Design a protein around this ligand. Structure first.
Ligand SMILES: CN1CCC[C@@H](Nc2cnn(C)c(=O)c2Cl)C1
Length: 108
């Protein structure tokens, strides 16, 4: 557990401090995206992920990876490809992928 928790903490740290992480630091507000919570069925953001991680809710890598991936896929499904949010999501998603591959967390 201690090795996994250490790895996941470092990953989320690097992701949340990335220059393209800013759109994902807090949950999407209804007022800023009317209808978001109708069309995006499972919202996720990095504050929520930090709360879940700190609460020791991620006893497997799989939940953590799925939640973090969904931050980016939600963004890239909702927003226009030419939007800054979409572009940030694409960049940060690639960073995320590099971090999980670096840690040996991809399925063998
Ligand atoms: C709370 N708010 C702070 C600024 C950035 C924003 N991020 C959004 C907003 N709307 N939508 C639709 C998004 O996809 C994102 Cl990432 C979230």
């Amino acid at each position: 557990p201690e090795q996994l928790y250490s790895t996941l903490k470092n990953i989320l740290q690097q992701v949340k401090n990335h220059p393209n992480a800013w759109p994902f630091m807090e949950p999407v507000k209804r007022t800023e995206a009317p209808g978001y919570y109708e069309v995006i069925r499972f919202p996720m953001d990095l504050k929520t992920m930090s709360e879940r991680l700190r609460n020791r809710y991620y006893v497997s890598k799989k939940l953590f990876m799925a939640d973090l991936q969904r931050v980016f896929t939600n963004c890239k499904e909702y927003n226009p490809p030419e939007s800054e949010y979409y572009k940030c999501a694409s960049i940060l998603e690639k960073f995320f992928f590099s971090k999980i591959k670096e840690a040996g967390l991809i399925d063998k």
